[PDB]
Design a protein around this motif. Structure first.
Motif, short mmCIF file in Angstrom:
data_model
loop_
_atom_site.label_atom_id
_atom_site.label_comp_id
_atom_site.label_asym_id
_atom_site.label_seq_id
_atom_site.Cartn_x
_atom_site.Cartn_y
_atom_site.Cartn_z
N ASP A 62 35.89 0.59 57.29
CA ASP A 62 35.46 1.78 58.01
C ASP A 62 34.51 2.60 57.14
OD1 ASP A 62 37.27 1.05 60.03
OD2 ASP A 62 38.84 2.37 59.26
N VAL A 63 34.89 2.79 55.88
CA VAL A 63 34.07 3.58 54.97
C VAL A 63 32.74 2.88 54.69
CG1 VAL A 63 33.93 4.44 52.62
CG2 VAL A 63 36.00 4.79 53.96
N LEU A 64 32.80 1.60 54.30
CA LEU A 64 31.56 0.90 53.95
C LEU A 64 30.61 0.86 55.14
CD1 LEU A 64 33.11 -2.00 51.85
CD2 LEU A 64 32.34 0.27 51.09
N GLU A 65 31.14 0.72 56.36
CA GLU A 65 30.27 0.71 57.53
C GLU A 65 29.66 2.09 57.78
OE1 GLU A 65 29.15 -1.65 59.15
OE2 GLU A 65 30.47 -3.37 58.85
N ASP A 66 30.45 3.14 57.62
CA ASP A 66 29.91 4.49 57.77
C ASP A 66 28.75 4.71 56.80
OD1 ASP A 66 29.76 7.23 58.69
OD2 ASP A 66 30.83 7.80 56.86
N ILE A 67 28.92 4.29 55.55
CA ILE A 67 27.86 4.47 54.56
C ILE A 67 26.63 3.66 54.95
CG2 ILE A 67 27.23 4.11 52.16
CD1 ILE A 67 30.24 4.61 51.52
N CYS A 68 26.83 2.39 55.31
CA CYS A 68 25.70 1.56 55.73
C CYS A 68 24.94 2.21 56.89
CB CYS A 68 26.18 0.16 56.12
SG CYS A 68 26.77 -0.84 54.78
N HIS A 69 25.68 2.66 57.91
CA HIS A 69 25.06 3.30 59.06
C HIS A 69 24.19 4.47 58.61
CE1 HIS A 69 24.83 3.82 63.41
NE2 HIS A 69 24.99 5.12 63.24
N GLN A 70 24.72 5.30 57.70
CA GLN A 70 23.97 6.46 57.23
C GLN A 70 22.72 6.04 56.46
OE1 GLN A 70 26.19 9.90 55.65
NE2 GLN A 70 28.11 8.93 56.29
N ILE A 71 22.81 4.98 55.65
CA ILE A 71 21.63 4.57 54.89
C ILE A 71 20.54 4.03 55.82
CG2 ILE A 71 20.73 2.93 53.21
CD1 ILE A 71 23.35 3.15 51.68
N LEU A 72 20.92 3.14 56.75
CA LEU A 72 19.91 2.56 57.63
C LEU A 72 19.32 3.59 58.59
CD1 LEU A 72 21.35 -0.98 58.27
CD2 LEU A 72 19.77 -0.17 56.49
N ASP A 73 20.03 4.68 58.87
CA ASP A 73 19.48 5.72 59.74
C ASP A 73 18.21 6.30 59.14
OD1 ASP A 73 21.51 5.33 61.51
OD2 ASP A 73 22.44 7.29 61.25
N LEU A 74 18.19 6.48 57.81
CA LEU A 74 16.98 6.98 57.16
C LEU A 74 15.80 6.06 57.45
CD1 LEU A 74 14.99 8.13 55.10
CD2 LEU A 74 17.05 9.57 55.17
N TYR A 75 16.03 4.73 57.40
CA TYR A 75 14.93 3.80 57.67
C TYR A 75 14.50 3.84 59.14
CZ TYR A 75 14.99 1.59 53.06
OH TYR A 75 14.89 1.35 51.71
N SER A 76 15.46 3.93 60.07
CA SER A 76 15.10 3.93 61.49
C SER A 76 14.38 5.22 61.88
CB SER A 76 16.34 3.74 62.35
OG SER A 76 16.03 3.75 63.73
N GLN A 77 14.85 6.36 61.35
CA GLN A 77 14.18 7.63 61.62
C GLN A 77 12.75 7.60 61.09
OE1 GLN A 77 14.88 10.62 58.74
NE2 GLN A 77 15.10 12.28 60.23
N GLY A 78 12.55 7.13 59.86
CA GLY A 78 11.22 7.11 59.30
C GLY A 78 10.42 5.97 59.90
N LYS A 79 9.29 5.69 59.27
CA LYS A 79 8.48 4.55 59.64
C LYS A 79 8.79 3.34 58.77
CE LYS A 79 3.78 3.65 61.40
NZ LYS A 79 2.43 4.24 61.63
N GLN A 80 9.42 3.57 57.62
CA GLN A 80 9.79 2.53 56.68
C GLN A 80 10.89 1.63 57.24
OE1 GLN A 80 10.92 4.29 52.95
NE2 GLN A 80 10.52 2.44 51.75
N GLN A 81 10.90 0.38 56.76
CA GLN A 81 11.87 -0.63 57.19
C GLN A 81 12.68 -1.13 56.00
OE1 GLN A 81 10.40 -4.29 58.89
NE2 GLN A 81 11.69 -4.15 60.72
N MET A 82 13.71 -1.93 56.31
CA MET A 82 14.58 -2.44 55.25
C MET A 82 13.76 -3.26 54.25
SD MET A 82 16.24 -1.25 57.62
CE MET A 82 16.43 -1.30 59.40
N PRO A 83 14.06 -3.18 52.95
CA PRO A 83 13.15 -3.82 51.97
C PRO A 83 13.03 -5.33 52.11
CG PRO A 83 14.58 -2.19 50.88
CD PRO A 83 15.13 -2.39 52.29
N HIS A 84 14.15 -6.04 52.24
CA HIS A 84 14.20 -7.50 52.30
C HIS A 84 13.06 -8.16 51.53
CE1 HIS A 84 14.92 -11.50 54.12
NE2 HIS A 84 16.12 -11.02 54.36
#
Ligand SMILES: COc1ccc(C)cc1N1C[C@@H](C(=O)Nc2nc3ccccc3[nH]2)CC1=O
Lengths: 329, 248, 826
Positions: free
Chosen positions: B226-248
């Protein structure tokens, strides 16, 4: 809560007097009004406004809230002068670092000639000091200012290390550039005299060995005013720095520059023949020229001299407080 | 003994700034700008990554006790970085921090520093220290990312790709209040977990226990997904809100 | 910076050592009496002693021994100073010209070593092959006496026995042999070694170790007829030599500790022994000759001869004349008679040599209504306790007032035309359960007497057991008339109560002049006293009345009158009491940041406090607030013996290391920290132990006021009887006199070739510093005694300064006048 430092006022302490001078401010002795416990207040003057809060104090606040050991002084809290109401820019008030008060300091007791140490007393003293150094060295912190003045001793016989103003973390993997001249000349290690600049935690051990000798002679072992003259005094007793005893001495910046008069042979065992053998072995290892061959703190605690010492029996040093004013007739 | 520096997400709707009429989106924006200001300024000065993070943690903690309307953020940020440098032994002169800030901030933004930039910053140090309760030692997700990664054994290239992607996620999490919710050890695991999902790696095989599917439980005890997913969700939100995408 | 001047008014009088030999010529018998830093040479005549020469040395004389190496016509003198300056000296006389030759010299200090508990010991081989020195625990230093060793180079032999009590070179051995008593956890032992100059180590000694008395103290090297050694203890005397062992334990010596020994008959048949209560004994070696022709030691006998002054050293001299060298009392010449007198004594005093003894305290008083102060000193100890009245006459006139008990503090009450003196006498636990005094003394021979009946500590319930024979101190306050010096009254304090402080003053609005005493309850169990009294007495109509008592929780080490209030120091605390209209003391304010407030002095509203450690503190009474304030503290760690205030900004202190220093208020004001820091601006090695600083001067003002360049007058008293004077200079006068010292040191030849600059360097075992801020007046005053060629050599290229004359040249006659004005300060 107990953890909200920087808010409680120094009103809460009755100041008894000034017990010494410190780098960032003058040190005071105070009694806590609520509990009656005697404390020590270090005044941190940030009014300088050149570079703000002194880094020396920052190191002592950062490190001593991490280190918990009997042989490490405990910072109890941080308190402030009555702050100006709702006007922080006008506020120039200072902060005070509260510490547990210690009855005496080693240099004070030795300089006043009022202290005499037996072997058992030296054992109890050194064991606490080295055990504290081991705790700090295991946490990868370097003291860098081991002097007799910085060893506080209670009348019970408890020892606590104190001035962490020059203390910094040590990284074995990454050699970090450090300030070359870091300990007082009398207790400075040979590498720093030759200018290593990338020192090992063994700098603190060399100092404690100088103290070990001083506890037996009652006089510092190497007292000189110039860095070269100190090397000469060290060289006479410990031997001249030479490639055979210190293979990497040639890589030191001043090895060619700073040279002793002669290539003196090591005479430590001869000149300290009056020291007990268990201690003499400890001194020879603690005062080894090569930092890589110098013993560790843990190794000193696993020595014949200090290993079987039991700290339940503190064995307090001889501090006569009466008939010392009168003169032996 | 030591202070508690972690709040619940729900508690962030009652920050001092929120209660002065600042809306959640604005305080989040202010927090990103201040943190990124600290990051950009320190990178220009050549500062170690720990020094940048320490300033950002000081910054984030500060505005859990004070309002953005009464304390201009870029002055606060500059003060945090100035103190962080002394704490982490990468010191800088206040005048130099001011100079770099002038380059990166426009004229209106530098207006926050008022008529005497150095003074406004130096004067704040007192309030910063009292606010952070003189708890200056801070641990950051970076050390744990490396301490845990060292215990992984496998393809050197696959693990290194995991580390760098996670490292980028750590740098991105400094712009958020995750630093104020979860201990750094959890953040390091969360970013390992996120990168693993993105790279389609099964980290369990690289751990000493290959059939331990909850691989992180050997590094961080008592952490639910639950915790790790909450953190992941919060991190990826920054990428979705911005124009930037996941580094990969 | 500060500038001060220090001179000797009276030279050291206590005898530190005495030897007899043939130093001036092989025919003459000489007695060399050593006082601190002073050597006196005499020639033994039939009537007494003939003085021939006195020299000063730039060092405290620690070892003095006479030896005659093969090839020399006469004895040579070895001296080692307490700072480890060694030298060999020779007497040379050319008609009327007497000088002392430095034959060899050097400093024998080791970089690393632990100073020994029983002090420096120096002995010389009977064949004068080497000098033995015991300077550090675990080490024996050998200076071989070869012709070429003009620098006195030496080597160390490792000594297993770390704690050595005493050592001597033995007689009648195949090699140089040492006999010594040492202590380890199993008790005390006597052991021998042989010293090899060729191998530079010890070899196995002639005879085996023997376990000796636990308090074995002195080793006697018995001469060749007997050989071996005698060991003196508290209860027994033993003789050791290989297989021979004797022990006599006569009950008479158990009574008092024996401190000195000397050989009477060169064959070793008879020795002199002396004990602290002054009894002089004869130790007799009873010979037995065997038909073999060899003489063995049959038995030992001890015979009591009589009483002398408590003697640090003894010398047999010739005939029955014996020199009693006393450090606690007057030295003497006494005659040993074969027939006892009608009292049973064989000892009759011939001559009495003044010794100001330990000067515990002193006061300056104008008794005869002149223009000069007379110095009344608390001098001597035990049966030698005396009050000495000193007035300037060219010599000092000294009157002796015997007390036969130890004087401790003295103060003067003019209203009562009397002196108040604190004294302590030794009594011994006796079979009654009480105690009995060994002799009558001032406190028992008072006209009227009183004893404290205070009930303050009477609750007790704290047990203190007594064993028969143990000593106790009984403390008294003595009222002594200023003209007759007759003991008018003696007040005895409580059992186990020590009198530590005394003042005479008026307090508050009270018109009566009181004697006030501060005491401490001293129990052997206590590390630091925890009970005490401040007692107010009134001396009125021949009787001392107890006016009021104040209980305190410690020892009242020091008290001083402070603007109608009483300033007293109780252990750590410094307190100010007010004197109420109800004639009781009331506390106004306290100061607690002290280790032990041993010493107090005042000036105005400023108080100077001297602790056991951490040097001196400047306190101030803030009358607007009713409290104390810490103005400035010296943060250098020093063990204080006495303190004095020079001016409102300069403060004088005396260290337990025989050093003097001056601290000045920094008198800047940029930072508060600078004001709070007292900077030590003067450092000086005196060479004496200063107990009492006292403002005043013995010089009589011719008329009105006449002043030399020196300003101010502080007299001080020392343990060796030396009285000195400290005074201040202007910057101009210091520089002139300092520049002259450097010139004088190049010209004047030192005994032992000891550098003057070294001698006066501040010295603790841990720190050594060059002197500063002090002019050695005794060096300046020697300019008048150097020959004319030397005088003119000194004044060459000498310029004056900071005056109306700007840079002025100096002539030999100009300086002769200047020094003569300086000689008038005392
Ligand atoms: C009444 O005592 C003093 C009066 C005047 C002076 C000048 C000194 C002394 N003192 C106080 C003692 C000390 O140094 N105490 C301490 N220093 C600390 C530093 C940090 C933390 C705790 C400490 N406790 C040793 C000593 O002689």
């Amino acid at each position: 809560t107990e953890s909200d430092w920087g808010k409680r006022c120094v009103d809460k302490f009755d100041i008894i007097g000034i017990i010494g001078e410190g780098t960032y401010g003058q040190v005071y002795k105070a009694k806590d009004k609520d509990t009656g416990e005697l404390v020590a207040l270090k005044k941190v003057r940030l009014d300088n406004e050149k570079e703000g809060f002194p880094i020396t104090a920052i190191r002592e606040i950062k490190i001593l809230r991490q280190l918990i050991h009997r042989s490490v002084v405990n910072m109890k809290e941080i308190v402030t002068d009555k702050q100006d109401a709702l006007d922080f820019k006008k506020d120039k008030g200072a902060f005070y670092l509260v510490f547990e008060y210690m009855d005496h300091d080693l240099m004070g007791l030795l300089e006043s000639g009022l202290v005499h140490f037996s072997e058992d007393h030296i054992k109890s003293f050194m064991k606490q000091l080295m055990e504290g150094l081991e705790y700090c060295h295991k946490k990868n912190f370097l003291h860098r200012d081991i002097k007799c003045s910085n060893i506080l001793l209670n009348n019970s016989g408890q020892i606590k290390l104190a001035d962490f103003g020059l203390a910094r973390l040590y990284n074995s993997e990454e050699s970090r550039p450090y300030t070359n001249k870091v300990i007082t000349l009398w207790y400075r290690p040979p590498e720093l005299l030759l200018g290593e600049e990338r020192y090992t935690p063994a700098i603190d051990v060399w100092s404690c060995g100088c103290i070990l000798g001083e506890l037996f002679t009652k006089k510092p072992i190497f007292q000189a005013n110039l860095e070269l003259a100190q090397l000469e005094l060290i060289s006479r007793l410990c031997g001249s720095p030479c490639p055979a005893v210190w293979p990497d001495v040639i890589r030191l910046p001043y090895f060619n520059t700073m040279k002793p008069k002669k290539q003196y042979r090591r005479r430590l065992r001869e000149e300290f023949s009056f020291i007990p053998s268990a201690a003499l072995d400890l001194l020879d290892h603690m005062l080894t020229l090569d930092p890589s061959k110098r013993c560790t703190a843990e190794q000193t605690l696993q020595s014949d001299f200090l290993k079987d010492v039991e700290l339940s029996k503190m064995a307090p040093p001889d501090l006569p407080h009466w008939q010392d004013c009168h003169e032996l007739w | 003994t030591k202070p508690c520096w972690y709040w619940d997400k729900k508690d962030l709707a009652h920050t001092p700034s929120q209660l002065e009429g600042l809306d959640p989106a604005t305080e989040a924006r202010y927090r990103r700008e201040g943190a990124r200001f600290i990051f950009d300024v320190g990178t220009r000065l050549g500062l170690h990554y720990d020094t940048l993070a320490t300033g950002i943690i000081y910054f984030h903690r500060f505005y859990m006790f004070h309002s953005f309307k009464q304390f201009p953020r870029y002055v606060t940020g500059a003060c945090c970085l100035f103190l962080a440098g002394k704490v982490e032994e990468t010191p800088k002169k206040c005048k130099d921090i001011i100079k770099t800030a002038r380059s990166l901030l426009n004229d209106v933004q530098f207006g926050q520093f008022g008529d005497d930039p150095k003074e406004e910053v130096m004067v704040l140090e007192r309030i910063l220290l009292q606010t952070i309760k003189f708890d200056l030692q801070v641990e950051h997700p970076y050390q744990f990312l490396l301490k845990y990664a060292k215990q992984l054994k496998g393809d050197k290239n696959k693990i290194q790709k995991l580390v760098q992607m996670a490292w980028t996620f750590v740098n991105d999490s400094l712009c958020t209040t995750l630093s104020l919710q979860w201990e750094p050890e959890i953040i390091a695991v969360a970013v390992m977990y996120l990168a693993g999902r993105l790279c389609k790696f099964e980290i369990q095989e690289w751990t000493s226990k290959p059939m331990y599917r909850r691989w992180w439980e050997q590094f961080v005890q008592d952490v639910p997904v639950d915790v790790l997913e909450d953190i992941c969700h919060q991190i990826l939100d920054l990428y979705s809100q911005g124009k930037q995408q996941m580094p990969h | 910076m500060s500038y001060n001047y220090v001179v000797t008014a009276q030279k050291p009088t206590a005898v530190n050592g005495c030897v007899t030999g043939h130093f001036t010529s092989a025919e003459d018998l000489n007695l060399l009496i050593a006082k601190n830093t002073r050597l006196e040479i005499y020639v033994v005549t039939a009537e007494g002693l003939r003085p021939v020469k006195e020299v000063g040395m730039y060092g405290k004389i620690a070892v003095m021994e006479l030896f005659r190496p093969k090839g020399e016509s006469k004895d040579l003198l070895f001296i080692l100073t307490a700072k480890y300056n060694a030298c060999i000296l020779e007497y040379k006389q050319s008609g009327e010209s007497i000088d002392i030759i430095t034959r060899a010299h050097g400093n024998v200090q080791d970089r690393i070593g632990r100073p020994s508990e029983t002090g420096i010991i120096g002995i010389i081989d009977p064949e004068c092959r080497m000098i033995g020195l015991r300077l550090y625990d675990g080490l024996f230093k050998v200076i071989p006496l070869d012709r070429d060793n003009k620098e006195l180079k030496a080597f160390n032999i490792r000594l297993e026995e770390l704690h050595v009590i005493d050592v001597k070179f033995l007689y009648g051995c195949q090699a140089p042999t040492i006999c010594f008593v040492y202590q380890d956890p199993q008790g005390r032992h006597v052991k021998t070694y042989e010293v090899s100059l060729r191998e530079k180590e010890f070899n196995k000694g002639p005879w085996k170790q023997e376990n000796v008395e636990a308090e074995a103290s002195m080793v006697i090297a018995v001469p060749e007829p007997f050989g071996g050694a005698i060991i003196i203890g508290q209860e027994s005397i033993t003789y050791h030599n290989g297989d021979k062992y004797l022990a006599i334990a006569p009950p008479i010596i158990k009574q008092s500790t024996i401190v000195c020994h000397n050989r009477v008959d060169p064959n070793g048949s008879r020795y002199l022994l002396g004990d602290m209560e002054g009894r002089l004994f004869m130790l007799l070696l009873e010979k037995e000759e065997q038909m073999d022709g060899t003489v063995t030691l049959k038995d030992l006998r001890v015979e009591l001869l009589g009483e002398t002054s408590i003697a640090e050293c003894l010398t047999y001299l010739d005939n029955g004349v014996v020199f009693v060298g006393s450090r606690l009392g007057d030295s003497q010449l006494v005659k040993l008679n074969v027939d006892s007198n009608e009292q049973g004594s064989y000892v009759v005093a011939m001559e009495t040599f003044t010794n100001l003894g330990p000067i515990v305290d002193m006061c300056v008083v104008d008794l005869e209504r002149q223009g000069q102060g007379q110095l009344v000193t608390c001098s001597g100890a035990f049966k030698e306790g005396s009050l000495r009245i000193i007035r300037n006459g060219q010599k000092l006139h000294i009157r002796t007032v015997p007390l036969y008990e130890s004087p401790r503090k003295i103060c003067y009450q003019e209203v009562s035309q009397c002196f108040g003196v604190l004294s302590s006498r030794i009594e011994v636990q006796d079979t009654s359960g009480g105690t009995t005094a060994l002799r009558p003394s001032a406190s028992t021979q008072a006209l009227s007497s009183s004893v404290s009946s205070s009930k303050l500590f009477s609750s007790s319930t704290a047990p203190h057991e007594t064993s028969f024979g143990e000593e106790v101190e009984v403390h008294n306050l003595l009222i002594i008339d200023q003209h007759t010096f007759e003991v008018l009254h003696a007040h005895q304090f409580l059992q186990n109560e020590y009198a530590l402080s005394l003042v005479s003053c008026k307090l508050g609005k009270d018109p009566n002049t009181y004697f006030i005493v501060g005491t401490a309850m001293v129990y052997p169990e206590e590390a630091e006293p925890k009970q005490g009294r401040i007692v107010v007495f009134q001396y009125s109509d021949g009787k001392l009345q107890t006016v009021a008592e104040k209980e305190v929780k410690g020892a009242v080490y020091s008290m001083v009158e402070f603007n109608g209030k009483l300033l007293a120091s109780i252990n750590s605390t410094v307190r100010l009491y007010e004197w109420t209209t109800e004639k009781e003391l009331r506390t106004e304010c306290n100061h607690y940041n002290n280790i032990m407030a041993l010493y107090l002095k005042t000036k105005g509203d400023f108080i100077l406090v001297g602790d056991l450690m951490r040097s001196v503190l400047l306190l101030a009474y803030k009358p607007m607030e009713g409290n104390f304030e810490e103005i400035a503290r010296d943060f250098n760690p020093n063990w204080m013996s006495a303190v004095e205030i020079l001016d409102d900004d300069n403060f004088l202190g005396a260290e337990n290391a025989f050093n003097l220093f001056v601290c000045q208020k920094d008198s800047a004001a940029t930072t508060d920290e600078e004001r709070q820091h007292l900077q030590e601006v003067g450092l000086f090695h005196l060479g004496e132990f200063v107990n009492v600083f006292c403002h005043g001067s013995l010089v009589m003002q011719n008329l009105g006021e006449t002043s030399t360049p020196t300003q101010g007058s502080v007299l001080f008293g020392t343990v060796n009887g030396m009285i000195g004077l400290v005074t201040s200079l202007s910057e101009s006068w210091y520089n002139l006199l300092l520049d002259m010292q450097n010139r004088l040191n190049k010209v004047i030849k030192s005994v032992g070739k000891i550098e003057h600059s070294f001698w006066r360097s501040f010295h603790t075992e841990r720190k050594t510093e060059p002197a500063t801020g002090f002019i050695d007046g005794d060096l300046i005053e020697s300019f008048l005694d150097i020959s004319r060629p030397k005088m003119q050599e000194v004044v060459a290229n000498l310029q004056y300064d900071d005056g109306s004359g700007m840079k002025r040249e100096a002539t030999a006659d100009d300086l002769i006048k200047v020094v003569e004005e300086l000689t008038r300060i005392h």
